[PDB]
Amino acid sequence: DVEDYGPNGVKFNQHGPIRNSGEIQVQCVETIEGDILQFIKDRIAAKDYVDITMAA
Amino acid sequence: DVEDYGPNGVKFNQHGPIRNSGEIQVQCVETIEGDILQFIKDRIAAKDYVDITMAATPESKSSGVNAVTKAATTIEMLDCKIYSDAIDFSTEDVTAAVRPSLRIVYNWIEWD
Amino acid sequence: DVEDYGPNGVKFNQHGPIRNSGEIQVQCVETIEGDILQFIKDRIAAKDYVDITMAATPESKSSGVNAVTKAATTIEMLDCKIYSDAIDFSTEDVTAAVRPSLRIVYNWIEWD
Amino acid sequence: VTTLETHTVSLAEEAKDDMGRLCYLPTALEARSKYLRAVVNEELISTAKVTNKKSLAFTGGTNGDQSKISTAAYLRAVKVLNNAPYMYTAVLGLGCYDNAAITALGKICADRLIDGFFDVKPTLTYAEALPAVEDTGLLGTDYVSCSVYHYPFSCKDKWTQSRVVFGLSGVAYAAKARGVKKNSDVGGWHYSPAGEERAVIARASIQPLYPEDTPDEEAMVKGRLNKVSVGTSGQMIIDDALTCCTQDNYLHFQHVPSLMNAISRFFVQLARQMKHSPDGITAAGLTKGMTKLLDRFVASGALVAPRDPDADGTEPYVLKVTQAEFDKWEVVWACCPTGVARRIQGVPLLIK
Amino acid sequence: SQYSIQQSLGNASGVAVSPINADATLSTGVALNSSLWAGIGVFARGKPFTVLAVTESNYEDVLGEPLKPSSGSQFEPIRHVYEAIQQTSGYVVRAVPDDAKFPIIMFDESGEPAYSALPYGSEIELDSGEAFAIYVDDGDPCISPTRELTIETATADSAGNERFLLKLTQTTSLGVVTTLETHTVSLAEEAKDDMGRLCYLPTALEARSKYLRAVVNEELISTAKVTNKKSLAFTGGTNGDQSKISTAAYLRAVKVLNNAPYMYTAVLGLGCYDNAAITALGKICADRLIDGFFDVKPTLTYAEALPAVEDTGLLGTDYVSCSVYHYPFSCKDKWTQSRVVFGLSGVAYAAKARGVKKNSDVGGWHYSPAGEERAVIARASIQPLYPEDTPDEEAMVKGRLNKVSVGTSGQMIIDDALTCCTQDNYLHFQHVPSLMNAISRFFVQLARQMKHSPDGITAAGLTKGMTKLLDRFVASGALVAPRDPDADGTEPYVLKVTQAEFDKWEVVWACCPTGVARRIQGVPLLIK
Amino acid sequence: ARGVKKNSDVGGWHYSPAGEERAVIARASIQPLYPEDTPDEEAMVKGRLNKVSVGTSGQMIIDDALTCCTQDNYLHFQHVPSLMNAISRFFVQLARQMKHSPDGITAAGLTKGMTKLLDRFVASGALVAPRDPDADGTEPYVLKVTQAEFDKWEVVWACCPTGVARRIQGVPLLIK
Amino acid sequence: GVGEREVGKLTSIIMNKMLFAQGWQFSVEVDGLEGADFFAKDITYHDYSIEYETIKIGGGNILQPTERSPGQITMMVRDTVDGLVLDWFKTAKSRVINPDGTGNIPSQYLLNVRIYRLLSSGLTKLENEMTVFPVTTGDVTYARDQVTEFKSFPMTFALHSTFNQSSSSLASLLGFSFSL
Amino acid sequence: TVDGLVLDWFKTAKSRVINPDGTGNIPSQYLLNVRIYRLLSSGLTKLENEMTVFPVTTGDVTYARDQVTEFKSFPMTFALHSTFNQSSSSLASLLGFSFSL
Amino acid sequence: GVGEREVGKLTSIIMNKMLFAQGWQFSVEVDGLEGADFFAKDITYHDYSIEYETIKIGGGNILQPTERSPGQITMMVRDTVDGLVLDWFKTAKSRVINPDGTGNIPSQYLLNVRIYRLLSSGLTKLENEMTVFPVTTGDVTYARDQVTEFKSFPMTFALHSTFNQSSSSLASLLGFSFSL
């Protein structure tokens, strides 16, 4: 939201760009040999992008 | 309040603009299919403004078939700017359900 | 206090202006129809100034029909700037009622 | 041309709609319609027939000369309003100056234990204004609650923007209304119809009646007359707290009659909701009722403690209840109301 | 074509201008209401024996056109109000002698016109004929200048009631005819306008016109007919001789002033010199605790000026709030540039009003009504009336009246601030009565606003009211700490508040004012 | 149309259809048809038809904003009928969009619709506070909303417009 | 209460609450601009400065006011959806200077800017009226990084003259043109 | 203040300083005596510095609506008439600030 | 609701939500550059300023506009993997000036820069079209400490002329060459 001010001290709020980007912190669990460790190592080696699906 | 200083070290306080705008954080609950999710998605698609009404209606004075309000305990809010926030569901949240929090920019308050 | 430094690394403290102005936060309670709400709405409509009196009257020394004060334990306050704050009512607030908080700019204290 | 309503009705004696509503002409007419009333021959209704007619304009409807109204009509209306099973709190002059009518009104309001706002017709100058109270004759030891009004001024019409003269009973009742609604727990019987922030009339283009007539404060206070003055912003205020009570007692005030009327009504309602019950617990019930009512008066703060502790006592509220015989439970109470603060005196002087 | 311009605006959308006018004077003024005032005057036009609020934009017409000095002794009040208006509005009361009669035009059943004249205050009655009548109340004799009326017809209303229009015009000595207003009205007993306005004849007339009133017979209104008439001018009405002024008119006007339900803190002589009227106004000042601005005959030389103070009869301890003025000089007219003489009472009032109005919170009531900022007469070509006569300083001082001296730039300053208070006590000044009057006011309104209040708070409200009003006075600088610390202390003010019974609260306050410096001492010497 | 279309929220329906911005005919070589004939101002006014006059730069302005309304009531202007027509439209579409709705909310929707439409009018400047405070009050508008039965809701609104200044008065004089 | 400093502070506070006003009552407007009072956000005004000259005299210098050096007006404004402010500026500068390069008459492109003070009842009263013409809006930056505020710019207008602040209406038969 | 009395005074001052017609005014009518005194414990004041100055310019001042916690305020610069012969007189006299040519 | 300031704020907010747009609809583009609308991040434009002179007249000075002092465009841009922006700049400056040193024809190395305003439907409308040529990219810094942002640089282009903004297509039988 853009918070603008006008004559007679009037406050106003206006649309802006979508705040589509940011950060998400998650908690998980690993395995005997480190599935997630090998996965992230391979991911950083490949230097690629990934797509995820979330559902309830 | 404008805090001014004058001669002889005097302090003074003077009127200013109404602090009519600001932010309100609220807590709610979703449904099976996400009523609030579809509502906010449609809201951001339409890119429009919404008006809300708040009131305090004690059940003792309630009459008729549905809750009836009075002008004393009712406030109408205009130019409401509705958005939601990310909600974290934990590991041990066995007895806890999702609590959707919404952040709402409010502009100016009207009383009826 | 003005904290000055002199030769030979000496520290010194001196009088300054009275710190007569500042802010006071108070807690109160509303009514069925919002006495305080109408009062503050009328106050902000009139755009005026208010005067308040504070006192400590132990019931042991109270005499007559209504509480009687003494000059020792009474303070009059002038140029009071009375505004309120948003009050959050929670989900589990089953046994808790609204606690209206007010922010008050005070300018200069008089003692009688 | 506008329409009021349309409705389908039937001539049949027992005609009824599918709504369950009877289609009979009179039944429907004075069941739903609130404008017309009809009479139908029960013998000719079977053979009655109707025709398609339009614009049945009424003719002959006249109001007549309303300037003069019979004392018989006055007393008839007085009896009607007396017999009305409705809650009313005061009676207004409303421009009626008939001596018989106003006396009947005084009797009725004395019976009702309510206030009266009687007025004298404004054109009468101050010189003869005082004898007018006696001419009315409403003064007495019973009609002490009512008050006498006069408005020696001319204002501007809201609608006809004409220089017109009329009374002040209505605005006085408005002042009473505002003074009683500003108090919520009981209502302001202890207030007075005065105050810059509270007593405002400000009708329109207020200007005097007689530039030659001069009143006398002592004469009017002796005659129990009510004066009206002006405020800072040009609005118009009522600078009185005096009734037409002949007795020099505190009944001459206006808040005191209001307070004992109120308390009387509370005792009446409590005793009457208490009636038709065998004793043994009724005494305790009435004692707790009097405790609770005195609780509300002390909350209001209208009553005050006696000003002389040793002689007048120290407790403002005195209460007692007893029984005489198989019936006649008597109850008595004594209270001390607050002051009025009639006048402030001020005299300057120099320290030198 | 569309280029030619007509005379006056009718109903067409356009511009019509009047012929250029040279003998027409208009001035600029916006009132601020610093000191409400009134005065008894005898003028042309306007309702006599009635208070009229005159602003900086109506004294030209509602008060009437200013007369000439040679026309009796009635130029004094018009000049006085002329200087008075440049500060704040007035509540003037006009008086006329018994010779004043207003004109009436009676229209019969068929509209037959007849003329008559009746004295002011006398009622109006209609005989069997003369269905109704109309009379002008503006005070204009309709002969110098002249005004005419025109009657025509128009369309009817929804109920079919006949509607006729009346137009008013004014004609000057030359003969220039200028319309003023026009109004349609229906003779119907229940006549209404298409906007719902009341078209009932006298009611509509009083609602629209501020100049004409009418009387209509209730038994002839039904049969009254209308007609088209042109050039209907009132005849036979005139104020008569305004030079002759009666003490009865004076006292009636004083009664009107008393009964006026408007605030006014100051009153003027306004060219009035009748001893009985002066005494009456002095009693009014005494019993209303207000300020009076009496003036004496300018023609009185200093020899007879001194006994005139005693001849006033206002000497005493009661009539101390008032002041008495004199002007033993001759000036030049602004308008007719004539050697004229009139009092400085209004000029002094305007000076003190300007001096007090610059202060904000309460006004500089303690200010000396003099100085370059105030004491400026400067009318035109000031010349002494009696150069032969000579005043005496000590006799003048004991006479307690106000004289006048030279100023900075050759202008002529009131060199006095002393009232007619006989006793030489500290209230014999002008600033002391000013402060007593001001405090009387403030006490009155604070008491009236706190009137009829539940007990237990009145004393507190009084305490803070006193504190705040002293705050205004100390801000104004009028009141200061006492000059005697050892015995009289250092407190500029002190308060006493208490009560006797359920009623009769009582308050006593003392305050110490500041100095004004109306006399100065100086001594020269050299070291050589 | 040009004069109204510059306004954004609703259009200056109240604007006088004249002025240099609007009253411009300027086709080519304008000449009078009947120089011999002459109009009459008062007869023309009672005739209620629109005549035309000279403009700023020699062009030719419609010097009238009066309709054929016979009665000399305040609706006999052109801006007044414009405002009745506009408000009639807005009322129609708001009613039609709220048509066939469950009860208990219609009154509220009407209230906020009135408020917002008055907002547009006061933004346009068409409606102002009444000039008579003492008797007619200072409120530029007032509303009444209620219902009779399961059907027939009813609303009555009053508003006070502003001025247009289609006639002017001027008087010269000199101080010489 | 009765102390000198308490009296001083009381006087100060009373006269302050009775004579002080915040920067509320103000209005900037320009002939031919609709809503400009709204879109403008800031103003910086200078009528003119007056220059002094120094003179050496003994041990002293005497400075004397010589001449009014003009000032300027600068208005900070945000535009609308359509860029109407830029449109107006384009038109203004076009009227000021012929893009063919010739000099336009310094009467057709002159605008009457005025700032009034508001009142408690919404009425306005004249405070400053200048006859100015555009010169330059300055080096303005535009990008996408303005993610919380709108692109806004200032415009600088130079007064026509510090002498003979005169203007007339073009809407007339004798327009701003003249006779050679 | 509410009325802009300071701006009013400045307008008047500069008007007296320089004719808008452009001519040079007499450097005696538009000269103001500014003085700073030191207060005392009893509120009395004593001379500390007295200059004879005239206005020159208030500077480039900014005015907007964003001043949402403080009041629009401005400086004024006054130049002394001269560092030599700090003299002044009262206009309120028969022989005013005008002279004989 | 019915108060004057409430009316004013209501009018302001309605006309604001109805007439205001953020700096959303905008597009910068250059002939011969693909993706430049994407790679460019900032723009700073100045067409030209106009200079005045002061003239001393009595107690007043009169300033009159002479002449359009020209401006410039400066574009802040990030490049691609291949440095195509630097490649384009190299080509541009090469065409502008012969590295042999001779003067090239001021028609072959002139580029038509244009900024358009977008629409709700994605359409674009002309807002400003200049005919410019490169001059210098400025003193740019490059290092490894840029550990959270990409190396990006500005380029400054000077307009060919504030007069006769003309251009033509080289793709023709009669090219940008002329007859001596």
DSSP readout, chain G?
--SHHHHHHHHHHHHHHHH---TTS-EEEETT-SSHHHHEEEEEEEEEEEEEEEEEETTEEEEEEEEEEEEEEEEEEE--TT-HHHHHHHHHHHHHB-TTSPBPPTTTS-EEEEEEEE-TTS-EEEEEEEEEEEEE---EEEES---SS--EEEEEEEES-SS------S-SSS-S----
The answer to whether I176 and I105 have CB atoms below 8 angstroms apart is: yes
Contacts of A5 in chain I (CB under 8 A): none
| Contact exists between H and C (3 or more beta carbon pairs < 8 Å) | no
Q: Which residue type is seen at E37?
A: W
Q: Is E301 exposed, middle or buried (0-12, 13-18, 19+ CB in 10 A)?
A: middle
Nearest CA in chain E to F175: E22
What's the CA gap between I31 and I113, in Å, rounded? 7
Tokens in use for F65?
């904003």
Question: Residue G125 and residue H10: Cα distance in Å, rounded?
Answer: 18
Please report, to the nearest 10 degrees, the dihedral formed by the alpha carbons of residues H3, H7, H8, H13 taken in order.
Answer: 160
d(CA D186, CA H30): 70
> What single letter denotes the amino acid at residue F174?
L
Say yes or no: B24 contacts chain C, CB-CB below 8 A: yes
Angle at CA D282, nearest 5°, toward D280 and D283? 80
- Interface contact F173-E13, CB threshold 8 A: no
- Chain G residues within an 8 Å CB radius of F56: 171-173
For residue D338, give the nearest of E51, E447, E455 by CB distance: E455
- What pairs with residue I125 in β-bridges? I117
D197/E449 CB distance under 8 A: yes
CB atoms within 10 A of CB E166: 22
> How determined?
cryo-EM
* G150 and I25 Cβ atoms separated by less than 8 Å: no
Beta bridge partners of F156: F144
- What letter would DSSP give residue E159? T
Sheet holding E113-119, edge to edge: E113-119, E101-107, E132-136, E212-216
Instruction: Show the tokens assigned to C80.
Output: 């009071």
Round to whole Å and give the CA distance between C44 and C63.
Answer: 38
Q: Please indicate if any CB of chain C lies within 8 Å of the CB of D170.
A: no
Q: Which residues of D236-270 are buried (b: 16+ CB within 10 A; e: fewer)?
A: bbbbbbbbbbeeeeebbbbbbbbbbbbbeebbeeb
Burial class of residue F124 (count of CB atoms within 10 Å of its CB; 0-12, 13-18, 19+)? buried
In degrees, to the nearest 5, what angle opens at C-alpha I61 toward C-alphas I55 and I65? 60
Beta-sheet pairing, D147-149 with D115-119:
parallel
Backbone angles phi, psi at C11, to 5 degrees: -100, 145
Contact list in B for residue C105 (CB cut-off 8 A) is: 1, 3, 13
Q: List Cα–Cα distances, E320 to E286, E287, I128, in angstroms.
A: 8, 12, 83
- Angle, CA of I23, I25 and I31, to the nearest 5°: 120
Tokens of G44: 């910086």
E56 touches E30 (CB < 8 A): yes
User: Do the beta carbons of residue E257 and residue E270 sit within 8 Å?
Assistant: no
Does any CB of chain C come closer than 8 Å to the CB of residue B9? yes
Q: Which of I130, I115, I128 is nearest to I25 (CA)?
A: I115
Strand boundaries in chain D, DSSP class E = 90-92, 115-119, 147-149, 153-156, 163-164, 207-208, 228-230, 236-238, 318-323, 329-334, 344-349
- Rounded to whole angstroms, how far apart are CA atoms E316 and E328? 25
The C-side interface with E (CB below 8 A) comprises 51, 53, 66
Chain F nearest CA to E517, separation (Å): 45
**DSSP code per residue over E260-271:** --S---EEE-TT
CA G123 to chain centre: 20
> In whole angstroms, what is the distance from residue E83 CA to residue E27 CA?
12
Sheet of E329-332: strand order equals: E339-340, E329-332, E383-384
Mutate to test the interface with B, among A11, A12, A24, A28 (most CBs of B within 10 A): A11
- Are the C-beta atoms of E431 and E417 separated by less than 8 Å? yes
Query: Cβ of I11 and F123 within 8 Å?
Result: yes
The answer for residues whose C-beta is within 8 angstroms of residue E300's C-beta and 6 or more apart is: E308, E326, E328
Cβ-defined contact of F56 to G171 (cutoff 8 Å): yes
Contact E456 C51 (CB under 8 A): no
CB D350 within 8 A of CB E512: yes
Alpha-carbon distance I48 to I143, whole Å? 36
Distance in angstroms (rounded) separating the CA atoms of residues H71 and H69: 7
| H or E segment to which residue E101 belongs | strand E101-107
Chain A positions in Cβ-Cβ contact with residue G78 (cut-off 8 Å): 4
Q: Within 13 Å, how many C-alpha atoms sit on residue B81's CB side?
A: 17
**Cα gap E312→D49, rounded to integer Å:** 97
Q: Report the distance separating Cα E109 and Cα E223, nearest Å.
A: 7
* H65–A6 C-beta distance less than 8 A: yes
Q: How far is D338 from chain C (nearest CA, A)?
A: 12
Chain H adjacent subunits, 3+ CB pairs under 8 A? A, B, E, G, I
Q: How many CB atoms lie within 10 A of CB E314?
A: 24
Enter the resolution in angstroms: 6.0
Distances (CA, A) of G179 to C34, E185, F93, G166, G176: 75, 57, 58, 19, 10
Local structure of A41: helix, strand or coil: helix
Terminal Cα distance for chain I, rounded: 78
Give whole-number Cα distances, F129 to F10, F141, G121, I7, in Å.
19, 8, 12, 11
Residue E395's φ and ψ, nearest 5 degrees, are -60, -40
Q: What is the DSSP letter of D301?
A: T
Interface of D with C in 293-322 (CB under 8 A): 301, 304-305, 316
Whether omega for the bond prior to residue E202 falls within 30 degrees of 0, making it cis, is no
What angle (nearest 5°) sits at the alpha carbon of residue I17, between those of residues I15 and I22?
120
Q: How many CA atoms lie within 13 A of E488 on its CB side?
A: 13
DSSP E4-63: S--SS--SSSS---PPP-SS----------SS-EE-EE--SSS-BSSEEEE-TTTTTTTS
Burial of F42 (0-12, 13-18, 19+ CB in 10 A): exposed
E475 burial type by CB count under 10 A (0-12 exposed, 13-18 middle, 19+ buried): buried
Contacts of F139 in chain I (CB under 8 A): 2
Residue F122 to residue I11, Cβ atoms within 8 A:
yes
Contact list in I for residue B112 (CB cut-off 8 A) is 1
What is the C-alpha separation between F128 and D274, in angstroms, rounded?
60
d(CA E59, CA E77): 12
Report CB contact under 8 Å: F56, G34.
no
Rounded CA-CA distance F121/F110 in Å is: 16
d(CA H26, CA H99) in angstroms, rounded, equals 10
Q: After which residue numbers is chain F interrupted with C–N beyond 2.5 angstroms?
A: none
In whole angstroms, give the CA distance from residue G139 to residue I72: 9
Task: Flag if G62 and H84 touch (Cβ within 8 Å).
Answer: yes
Look up residue F44 and give its amino acid. M
Task: Count CA atoms within 13 Å of residue E100 on its CB side.
Answer: 26
Residues B104/B83, Cβ–Cβ less than 8 Å: yes
Q: How far is B10 from chain I, CA to nearest CA, in Å?
A: 31
Please judge whether D214 and E259 are an interchain contact, meaning their C-beta atoms are less than 8 angstroms apart: yes
The token duo for E42 is 């005898």
Q: Which residues, in sequence order, are bridge partners of residue G132? A: G111, G159
Give the Å distances, CA to CA, from E70 to E45, E380, H101: 19, 18, 45
Give how far Cα E392 sits from Cα of C98, E302, E323, E422, Å.
82, 8, 20, 18
Say if residues B23 and B80 touch (Cβ distance below 8 Å): no
Give the span between the Cα atoms of E328 and D154, in whole angstroms: 46
Q: Do chains E and I touch (3 or more CB pairs under 8 A)?
A: no
Chain F: nearest CA to B110, how far in angstroms? 12
H68 by DSSP, 3-state: which? coil
Give me E175's structure tokens: 């003969």
> Looking at E204-285, which runs of residues are DSSP E strands?
212-216, 229-233, 266-268
d(CA I46, CA G91): 16
Token pair 């009381």: residue: G10
Report CB contact under 8 Å: G171, F20.
Answer: yes
- How far apart, in whole angstroms, are the C-alpha atoms of residue D228 and residue D168? 10
- Token pair recorded at residue E350: 């305007």
